[PDB]
Each structure stands twice: as C-alpha cells, then as structure tokens.
C-alpha cells in the first residue's frame, strides 16, 4: 500500500536554479559562485 513520509521540508530548503541567470548564463571569468553558495546556505538552520 502506498504511504507518504513528509519530513517537513520547507520550500526554502529545496531551492532550484530556475530563472534566467541560473549559473551558466553568468560568465565564469567574471562571476563568483560563492555568493550564490552563501545565499543558499543562509537559511540552513545550522552550520553546514
């Protein structure tokens, strides 16, 4: 019988690169991914 397991994952923890500037549209020579990394990591509810 099918069952569901919903741990309670808030949508802020399932971010997707959807949008016109995900990572490839940005120039690799000019862009710094660490800003995206920390922007995603700020809502982590703990040290990653």
């Amino acid at each position: 019988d099918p069952v569901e397991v919903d741990m309670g994952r808030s949508e802020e923890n399932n971010i997707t690169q959807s949008g016109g500037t995900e990572w490839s549209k940005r120039d690799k020579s000019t862009y710094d991914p660490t800003d995206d990394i920390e922007a995603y990591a700020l809502n982590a509810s703990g040290v990653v």
């Binding site: 069952v3 569901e4 397991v5 919903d6």
Partner: protein
C-alpha cells in the same frame, strides 16, 4: 503522515480578572462556550447575540448549554481574543465585532 498541532487554548489575552455570573436564559439553539449573549427585548431572558443589534451584546458564554438550561453562567468581566470567540455570522464588520462589547467589563483584543 498526519500533522496535528498541539496548541494551547488561550481565551484570555489580558491579565485583567474574569468573573462568572449566573442568569436566566432563553437560548433557542445549541451554543458552545465563548458565544456572545443578548437580552430578549420582551422576555428579558438571555439568548445568543444576533450579531445585528448595536449595543445588545452583554456577555460571553462560560459553559455550553441547551434550550432546557434555565440558568446559565457567563463571563461578566475580562478580556478575550478576537479569534478564540465564536461569533454569529451576522456580525461582519471587523470594527463592529471588536467594539460590540464596548462600555462593559468584557473587552476584546
């Protein structure tokens, strides 16, 4: 799977003391606690507040009662919450709902 929230029941929103009082009632339909009350213009008994007449609100129900309940107790004093008190559907304006218990010892917050 199932998600039931364990929330505290908080009828009072202020430290002001609340006091109970007994009175005759003319309740017409089954009504749970935290029901607004009013006096019948003719029989002078207690019934559920219409939500229409201005200033007719007098008190809030203490314990649920039926039609056969000749005597009922209700809060004559205290402050309650705008959300934990059930209301007649007639009282639609938020301002009217807030100020329905004006001029007495029953207050809303």
């Amino acid at each position: 799977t199932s998600k039931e929230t364990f929330t505290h029941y908080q009828p009072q929103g202020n430290s002001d003391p609340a006091h109970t009082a007994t009175a005759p009632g003319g309740l017409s339909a089954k009504a749970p606690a935290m029901t607004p009350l009013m006096l019948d213009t003719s029989s002078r008994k207690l019934v559920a507040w219409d939500g229409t007449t201005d200033g007719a609100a007098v008190g809030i129900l203490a314990v649920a009662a039926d039609q056969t309940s000749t005597t009922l107790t209700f809060y004559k004093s205290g402050t309650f919450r705008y959300e934990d008190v059930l209301w007649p559907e007639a009282a639609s304006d938020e301002t009217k709902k807030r100020t329905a218990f004006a001029g007495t010892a029953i207050s809303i917050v």
